[PDB]
Write a protein that binds this ligand. Structure first.
Ligand SMILES: [Mg+2]
Ligand SMILES: [Mg+2]
Ligand SMILES: [Zn+2]
Lengths: 147, 86, 196, 144, 210, 60, 49, 96, 769, 98
């Protein structure tokens, strides 16, 4: 009916294919500001949360796990193939937009003290150390003892 | 006599500046902290920053402000001859 | 309180303050919120997508189905989603009224409640602190150590010394360079100035 | 480092994680010098552009214009609660603006209790609706 | 070119050099300072034909000042590149007439053998050197040029004996400034500057000629 | 002569929205300026600078 | 490295579908650091014999 | 060598005269609090358990200063170190 | 605390319900955009048919991008005005905008109505994908949705073709932010290393570190800057009739009980000739301060900044004493005149003995004396304010108390304050989308590279500029104004010549060209006696006729210049401008004596075949008809009504605008531009700094550089006090020579030995000392 | 990492110095050693001599690898076995009727 041209040769698979790994986590990237969408890729990388399954065999200096890794409710079907619903990074906390007492000013929020006592974002700081028992010369070496 | 010329003609208005108020309050607080005779009458306080502040309003602090001129000379000023600004 | 957090929409926010359940407002049945965000943080950065998750999560919670969040769909996420929420027994725009947690007076405005998925950054507030009164001092220039790893002092940039001149504090600047930093004295001869 | 919103404006810092240093003087002559110079009650109006640096925006700005709204009428139990919240108060309850039927107060009478009775500021208003001049100049209609 | 439009160039440079002397302290008649283009070709019969020493008839000799000195012979050369032969002739007209100051304006440039004797010349004699490319327009009429007033010896001694202003404490200036060359100032004198201030109304400063 | 005369009439632009009213010459010869997008703590405000009579102020 | 002095990056038209535009660090490495789209295959090389 | 240590390339000029380290300082994370005054800055409890200040002993309040010394270094209202007139810097933690 | 506690019991939230407009209004929003799309297609349809009239000043492609700019601008502004009336005052979204925060009118349309055009670096979206932007569109498609414009908002989502375009605008503000942030640590660090020498001493005169007087007093008034407030002079009155009726008043009023109320003392001095002389002479002094005020403030802006606001101090005394127009106020006439003279004597800040020191005090506080006398006049204190004797006595004691606190504190380290006074506004938005249009181009670089180059003071700027003014008939007529443009523009000879060919013409009288045969034959008066042994090779050039009507040139001015460049050994001939084309034949002037193997010499001077190739390539570049070489050839007119310039006086006294024809060049040759005719050498300025010291001198650098820095702050949106702009110019121009005060020029200075070594040298400086 | 496509002749703009155009083109091997080998063919922007040729703007003098200064490109055609202008013009364009 109304079409300026009808000589198409190729077609895209899905309009959401232009996003990446961290860009597909935020829902509806078009309704938000364009420079604000770039900050999400820097936040999701330096964030906490579970990342694998075997947590007792790995001994990394910086490892943070979550007690209750709940999957996000409002999610996209593109992250189902990237293995995101099985290894999230938080919970679905009920966020009520309100002013309260004016203590959530400029990049800050107000939380509940009773909610944290029940298991609200409780993580464990895993840090592994190592000490090599090397030589110190010809007749000089380290000896593990209890002086 | 070849440098102090405060007993003839003075050019700066007789008023205490914000820089002189900081030194007088700081120097007097250090002297009183080292057991010094109080110029005024004590009413019952132990804060060294408050004792020097009370003596400033009573203009009883025996100090002479020596303002060194950049040309090479210098002028003298007293506490009574300088009105504090708040 | 003080740890650095973030969000899935890009509006990061640290832990400002945490009150008890009785000191926080509540709806009608007793739905107490978990995270309170600044309402003015939305128009300041034009974060409209943050309100979409807060509304879509409420409709999916009353239905019990994982709703799709495709940004290129034809289901109309403006009127169809709003009309479905009013059928369960709530407001179609998603706005609800709460009660005062201290006096019991009804809130004049309408708090837009709804679940929102957040994350947690790796920035410990108790690990980034650095304070010391008097500890180990180096011998090369009689200065503190590097940082907290070896118990040292804080960095003194050039901008802190440049602005100190504008304040006119000569005694305060001398303390940060001679007194409370590198205290030392050298005897100087009278006939000559050679330090020997 | 819990601080006031009026202090964050001149520093132009953010609470997202911007660390700020805090030194400590170790001399009596230096504490009296900073207290009489490097302070926020004195460093308000800067000589760079003869204008103050203290800004009151964000949450402390919308509640100001809403408290003085025409559709605001406080009751009797809310006036005495706000009088105690004042840091200083002579101890004189103001006369109600409405005596009958119910003794109520206007939205600008409680806000006027903080301002002393020897300072004013007119002319400058900076609004948005109505019209830029012309309109209010007709028949001399001040207010609003 | 070099026909009728050249008359306006010779008339514009004449009004500039007359205002250069009146600003110092000389008294010039109103008829000589205020004239039009048609009046310049009627005071002595200008442009009778083509080709004539037009720069020779521009010789003026003013003698009106409070200081009983006067007698300032001003002559314009004819050749563009003033060599050493013209300098040896120009220095002979000032010895017989016994003038006080000179004012020569070279078109293009001079020779290195003549520029050395122009500055020295005599310890008790001062000679001025200008240029046609800088005298065609008056640079003192610009809005960014403040009022420049010369000073005497008694005014400098009284100023330095008031606020104890030392010689090194006063700002300096180079000799390449066309403003300093507009009045013929010497090295070691203070020139009063009258700058119109905005937040005050009138700002007065002093500078030394290095 | 008419082709080169109209060269200095339209120039490269136009502006002049004719909305704001100047309070110095009872005319509406004012323009807008889309300045201040994010800035810092200072709120954004479209500056209005009047062409004739030299006038300028702030929208808020 | 091989080419500098007034050479901005900005955004190119060929970035559509190949590189994720909304995925860059917030530091000084913005624009310079590139990434890959969700569905994109990288060439490995072949012999056109 | 000897010139590089004084030229300015992280030597005795930029790395010492133009960029050194001082003592008695704190740097945490700022949080909004409009309820406080214009000069009431936040001071943590863990930071206050280390920031000390040498105060001279005056006879006008010798009883109040002695109470902080008697309690030792077991809580916040107390004293940690003491300095005499000659230069004796005696500790109160391991004091008998 | 009270406002913060009230927000808990009140509430102010935001959500989906606060971003919904009217149902009938939203229907008109989407219909208005569709009407704007038909206007864009109408321009495209009229452009391909070769019938559209381009805008005078640009080409055809530059006109299409300009016509669509005003269409999309009015489309995004008309739909935004409809959404403003739909949202009521109850909506919490509008309360965030009315309060004055991070949100205005443009933020409402970008989330509900329409976003707008997403331009890049001022210009529109270029082509970088085979003359296109995205493969989803067809070739040769100048649609709005395919050139960065987003037709939707942040509510109904964005199309894939528009989401990629809107992401380009966000990357421009994010990458430039990281680059500008790193420049803050380099520009501010350079300023504090050279400006920290000067400081405010105790004897008013501003000195430095080596004891040298820089200025006579801080701020040219000896007062502080914290007490300075935006006042209002209210003296430049248009009609002079209202100026005399407002201030001057006589005792010859109506007999109807006049001069009897309010002041109960006028009845005693009725018909007093002694007091009349004091009031008559007072108005004469006011007229003296008015005529000179035109020279002091040639712009015509009375609203300046001055300390001690007299508009608030006088009105504050009316509330304490309860002053109202319905009350008689007894005011003494002589006390008002004596009160001003007595208060003026207390304004002395320097020595007071010799008569020379009193001249330096009146001019230093001349603006403060006029503002004090005009406000505290004899009639202003009795008609507009209506103050009594007790209200005027206490007012004199309050002004003197506030004046003492407004004095600048002697000892203020201004070295660090002046360095931060310039770097603070530089961190705002200096280089962020060249918004300065003004029906002109993007001349004069403004941003980051401008500040980094002005401090380093190079030899030649990046984008020079020099505005040329005109007077006489050219200030109202357009024909005479363009006649000077032909002499000032550097019209190259290559642009005039349209074609050049090499022909073989044996007989010069009987040429082979048919269309140019009778032109070289009828000319017989030319001495054709030495043209029989000249160069047979003909080098005929062709002159473009379309260029003659655009630059206004003749044929007699071309032949007289070619023969005066190479020499007399060059023949030139041309025809009239009425044939079919403009041609011009050139030949050589053979002496016919010893120019034919006279001395043999197997060296060959110049072959005839390659002789014409050297002149053909040397005349089209070296030879110039008229114009300066180092001023380029670009020109653009600016509206005189826009900027606040040219404020002349009339017989009435009002300030009116005087329109004229002004132009701008692209050079620094100030000596040759000012030497031209008709051009006014008074208000002709330029952005260059090096040529000012050479042509004018260092006395004009302090006034020219200060105006250049003031234009940057006037457009950026911030403000800078006048006491800091005059100090920066006096600090750099203190030695009497234009030299970089930073690291590039420190050895020539006469500072201390421990100061020169702090410029990353140390060893290189200590070895010399 | 990321590099530019080799074995492709590209035309760039280089008008900051004494040049006007630049035709940078690499020549690396497939899978052997690929010693970069970048062919630098630039166009100068000088114009006007004095009295010799007065046509320096028509020169090319490309920057061949290893080579110190710049040498013309037409000299290479003499070494490739072509000493006639008819054959050299055939290498440039296959249709000399323009
Ligand atoms: Mg910040
Ligand atoms: Mg902030
Ligand atoms: Zn106007």
């Amino acid at each position: 009916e109304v079409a300026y041209c009808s000589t198409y040769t190729h077609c895209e698979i899905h309009p959401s294919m232009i996003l990446g790994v961290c860009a597909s986590i935020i829902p509806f990237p078009d309704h938000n500001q364009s420079p604000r969408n770039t900050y999400q890729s820097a936040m999701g990388k330096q964030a906490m949360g579970v990342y694998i399954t075997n947590f007792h065999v790995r001994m990394d200096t910086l490892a943070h796990v979550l007690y209750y890794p709940q999957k996000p409710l409002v999610t996209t079907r593109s992250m189902e193939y990237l293995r995101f619903r099985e290894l999230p990074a938080g919970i679905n906390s009920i966020v009520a937009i309100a002013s309260y007492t004016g203590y959530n000013q400029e990049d800050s929020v107000i939380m509940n003290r009773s909610a944290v006592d029940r298991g609200f974002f409780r993580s464990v700081f895993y840090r592994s150390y190592k000490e090599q028992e090397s030589k110190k010369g010809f007749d000089q070496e380290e000896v593990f003892e209890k002086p | 006599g070849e440098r102090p010329q405060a007993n003839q003609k003075r050019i700066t208005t007789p008023y205490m500046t914000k820089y002189e108020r900081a030194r007088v309050l700081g120097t007097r607080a250090l002297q009183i902290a080292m057991c010094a005779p109080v110029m005024v009458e004590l009413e019952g306080e132990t804060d060294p920053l408050l004792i020097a502040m009370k003596e400033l309003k009573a203009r009883k602090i025996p100090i002479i402000i020596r303002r060194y001129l950049p040309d090479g000379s210098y002028e003298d000023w007293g506490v009574d001859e300088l009105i504090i600004t708040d | 309180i003080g740890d650095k957090f973030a969000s899935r929409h890009g509006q990061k926010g640290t832990c400002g303050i945490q009150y008890r359940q009785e000191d926080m407002p509540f709806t009608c049945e007793g739905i107490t919120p978990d995270i309170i965000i600044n309402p003015h943080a939305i128009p300041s950065r034009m974060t409209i997508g943050h309100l979409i998750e807060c509304l879509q999560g409420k409709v999916s919670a009353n239905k019990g189905e994982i709703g799709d969040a495709t940004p290129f769909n034809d289901a109309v996420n403006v009127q169809k989603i709003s009309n479905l929420l009013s059928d369960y027994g709530y407001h179609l725009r998603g706005n609800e009224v709460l009660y005062n947690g201290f006096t019991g007076r009804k809130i004049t405005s309408q708090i837009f409640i709804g679940p929102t998925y957040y994350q947690r950054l790796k920035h410990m507030v108790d690990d980034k602190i650095h304070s010391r009164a008097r500890g180990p001092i180096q011998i090369l220039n009689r200065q503190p150590m590097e940082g907290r790893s070896r118990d040292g002092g804080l960095r003194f940039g050039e901008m802190e010394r440049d602005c100190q001149i504008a304040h006119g504090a000569a005694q305060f600047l001398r303390e940060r360079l001679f007194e409370a930093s590198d205290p030392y004295q050298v005897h100087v001869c009278n006939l000559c100035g050679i330090m020997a | 480092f819990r601080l006031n919103l009026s202090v964050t404006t001149p520093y132009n810092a953010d609470f997202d994680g911007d660390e700020m240093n805090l030194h400590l003087p170790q001399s009596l002559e230096t504490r009296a010098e900073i207290q009489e110079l490097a302070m926020v009650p004195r460093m308000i109006v800067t000589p760079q552009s003869n204008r103050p640096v203290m800004g009151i925006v964000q949450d402390t700005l919308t509640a100001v214009r809403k408290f003085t709204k025409r559709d605001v009428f406080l009751e009797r139990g809310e006036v005495m609660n706000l009088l105690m919240f004042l840091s200083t108060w002579d101890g004189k309850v103001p006369q109600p603006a409405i005596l009958k039927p119910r003794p109520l107060w206007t939205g600008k009478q409680i806000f006027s209790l903080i301002i002393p009775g020897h300072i004013n500021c007119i002319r400058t208003h900076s609004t948005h609706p109505d019209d830029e001049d012309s309109g209010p100049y007709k028949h001399i209609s001040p207010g609003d | 070119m070099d026909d009728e439009e050249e008359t306006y160039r010779l008339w514009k440079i004449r009004k500039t050099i007359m205002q250069l002397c009146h600003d110092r302290g000389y008294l010039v008649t109103q008829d000589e300072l205020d004239q039009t283009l048609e009046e310049f070709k009627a005071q002595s019969g200008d442009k009778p034909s083509e080709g004539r020493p037009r720069r020779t008839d521009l010789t003026v000799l003013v003698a009106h000042n409070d200081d009983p000195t006067d007698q300032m012979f001003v002559f314009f050369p004819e050749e563009p590149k003033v060599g050493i032969k013209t300098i040896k002739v120009y220095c002979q007209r000032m010895q017989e007439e016994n003038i006080t100051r000179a004012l020569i304006v070279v078109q293009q440039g001079m020779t290195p053998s003549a520029k050395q004797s122009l500055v020295d010349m005599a310890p008790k004699y001062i000679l001025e050197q200008f240029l046609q490319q800088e005298l065609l327009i008056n640079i003192t009429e610009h809005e960014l040029v403040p009022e420049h007033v010369v000073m005497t010896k008694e005014e400098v001694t009284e100023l330095l004996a008031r606020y104890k202003l030392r010689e090194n404490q006063l700002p300096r200036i180079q000799a390449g400034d066309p403003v300093a060359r507009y009045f013929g100032i010497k090295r070691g004198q203070v020139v009063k500057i009258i700058r119109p201030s905005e937040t005050a109304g009138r700002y007065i400063t002093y500078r030394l000629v290095q | 002569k008419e082709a080169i005369r109209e060269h200095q009439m339209a120039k490269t632009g136009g502006t002049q929205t004719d909305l704001f009213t100047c309070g110095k010459c009872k005319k509406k010869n004012c323009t807008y300026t889309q300045v201040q997008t994010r800035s810092a703590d200072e709120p954004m405000t479209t500056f209005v600078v009047c062409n004739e009579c030299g006038n300028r102020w702030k929208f808020c | 490295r091989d080419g500098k002095l007034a050479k901005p990056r900005q955004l190119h038209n060929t970035l559509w579908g190949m590189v994720c535009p909304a995925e860059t660090p917030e530091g000084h490495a913005v624009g310079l650091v590139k990434n890959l789209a969700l569905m994109a295959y990288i060439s490995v090389g072949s012999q056109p014999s | 060598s000897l010139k590089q240590r004084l030229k300015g390339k992280e030597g005795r000029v930029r790395g010492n005269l133009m960029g050194k380290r001082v003592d008695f300082s704190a740097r945490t994370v700022i949080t909004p609090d409009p309820n406080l005054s214009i000069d009431q800055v936040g001071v943590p409890r863990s930071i206050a358990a280390n920031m000390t200040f040498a105060e001279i002993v005056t006879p006008f309040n010798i009883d109040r200063l002695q109470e902080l010394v008697r309690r030792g270094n077991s809580q916040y209202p107390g004293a940690k170190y003491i300095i005499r007139d000659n230069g004796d810097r005696i500790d109160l933690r391991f004091h008998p | 605390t009270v406002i913060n506690n009230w927000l808990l019991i009140e509430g102010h939230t935001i959500g989906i319900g606060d971003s919904i407009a009217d149902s009938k209004t939203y229907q008109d929003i989407q219909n208005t955009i569709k009407k704007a799309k038909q206007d864009v297609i109408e321009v495209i349809e009229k452009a391909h048919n070769n019938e559209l009239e381009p805008t005078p000043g640009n080409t055809l492609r530059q006109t299409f991008e300009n016509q669509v700019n005003r269409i999309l601008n009015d489309a995004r502004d008309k739909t935004g005005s409809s959404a403003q009336k739909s949202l009521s005052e109850y909506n919490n979204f509008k309360s965030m905008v009315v309060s004055g925060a991070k949100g205005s009118k443009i933020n409402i349309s970008q989330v509900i109505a329409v976003v707008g055009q997403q331009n890049v670096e001022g210009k529109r979206i270029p082509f970088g994908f085979k003359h296109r932007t995205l493969p989803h569109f067809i070739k040769d498609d100048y649609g709005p949705e395919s050139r960065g414009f987003v037709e939707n908002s942040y509510l109904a989502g964005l199309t894939p073709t528009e989401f990629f375009f809107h992401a380009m605008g966000g990357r421009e503000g994010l990458i430039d932010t990281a680059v500008k942030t790193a420049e803050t640590g380099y520009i501010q660090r350079r300023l504090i290393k050279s400006m920290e020498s000067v400081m405010v001493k105790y004897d008013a005169t501003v000195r430095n570190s080596i004891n040298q007087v820089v200025q006579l007093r801080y701020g040219e008034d000896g007062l502080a800057g914290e007490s300075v407030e935006f006042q209002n002079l209210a003296t430049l009155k248009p009609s002079n009739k209202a100026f005399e009726k407002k201030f001057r008043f006589d005792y010859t009023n109506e007999r109807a009980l006049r001069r009897t109320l309010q002041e109960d003392l006028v009845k005693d001095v009725l018909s007093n000739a002694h007091i009349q002389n004091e009031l008559e002479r007072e108005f004469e002094r006011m007229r003296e301060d008015r005529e000179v005020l035109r020279v002091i403030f040639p712009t015509g802006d009375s609203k300046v900044v001055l300390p001690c606001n007299l508009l608030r101090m006088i009105w504050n005394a009316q509330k304490i004493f309860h002053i109202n127009p319905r009350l008689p106020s007894d005011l003494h006439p002589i006390k008002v005149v004596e009160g001003v003279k007595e208060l003026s004597k207390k304004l002395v800040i320097v020595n007071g003995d010799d008569p020379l020191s009193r001249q330096a005090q009146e001019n230093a506080t001349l603006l403060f004396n006029i503002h004090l006398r005009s406000t505290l006049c004899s009639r202003r204190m009795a008609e507009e304010f209506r103050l009594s004797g007790e209200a005027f006595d206490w007012l004199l004691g309050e002004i003197e108390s506030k004046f003492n606190q407004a004095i600048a504190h002697p000892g203020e380290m201004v070295g660090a304050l002046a360095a931060q006074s310039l770097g603070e506004p530089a961190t705002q938005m200096t280089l962020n989308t060249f918004h300065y249009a003004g029906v002109s181009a993007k001349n004069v670089t403004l941003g980051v590279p401008r500040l980094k180059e002005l401090i380093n003071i190079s030899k030649k700027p990046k984008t020079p500029s020099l505005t040329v003014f005109l007077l006489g008939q050219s200030a109202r007529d357009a024909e005479r104004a363009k006649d000077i443009l032909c002499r000032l523009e550097h019209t190259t000879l290559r642009k005039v010549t349209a074609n050049t060919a090499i022909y073989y013409d044996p007989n010069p009288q009987s040429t082979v060209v048919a269309e140019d045969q009778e032109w070289v034959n009828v000319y017989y008066e030319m001495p054709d006696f030495d043209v029989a042994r000249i160069s047979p090779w003909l080098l005929r050039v062709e002159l473009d006729r379309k260029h003659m009507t655009d630059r206004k040139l003749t044929m007699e001015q071309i032949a007289e210049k070619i023969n005066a460049g190479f020499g007399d050994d060059l023949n030139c001939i041309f025809n009239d401008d009425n044939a079919e084309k403009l041609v011009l034949r050139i030949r050589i002037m053979n002496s016919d004596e010893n120019k034919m193997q006279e001395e043999e010499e197997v060296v060959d001077k110049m072959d005839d075949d390659v002789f014409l190739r050297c002149i053909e390539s040397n005349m089209l570049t070296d030879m110039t008809l008229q114009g300066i070489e180092q001023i380029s050839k670009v020109y653009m007119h600016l509206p005189q009504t826009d900027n606040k310039k040219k404020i002349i006086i009339t017989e009435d006294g009002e300030f009116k605008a005087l329109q004229e024809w002004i132009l701008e060049t692209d050079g620094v040759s100030l000596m040759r531009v000012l030497s031209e005719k008709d051009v006014d050498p008074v208000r002709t300025t330029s952005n260059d700094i090096v040529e000012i010291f050479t042509v004018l001198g260092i006395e004009a650098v302090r006034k020219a550089l200060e105006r250049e820095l003031y234009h940057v702050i006037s457009f950026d949106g911030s403000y800078v006090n006048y006491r800091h702009l005059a100090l920066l110019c006096d600090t750099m121009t203190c030695r009497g020579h234009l030299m970089a005060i930073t690291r590039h020029g420190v050895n020539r200075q006469d500072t201390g030995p421990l100061m020169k070594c702090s410029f990353e040298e140390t060893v290189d400086v200590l070895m010399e000392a | 990492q990321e590099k530019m496509a080799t074995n492709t002749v590209y035309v760039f703009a280089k008008k900051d110095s004494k040049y006007a155009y630049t035709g940078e083109c690499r020549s690396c091997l497939e899978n052997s050693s690929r010693p970069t080998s970048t062919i630098w063919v630039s166009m100068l922007a000088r114009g006007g001599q004095g009295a010799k040729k007065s046509a320096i703007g028509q020169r090319i003098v490309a920057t061949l690898p290893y080579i110190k200064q710049e040498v013309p490109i037409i000299i290479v055609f003499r070494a490739l076995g072509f000493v006639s202008d008819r054959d050299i013009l055939e290498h440039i364009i296959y249709d000399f009727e323009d």
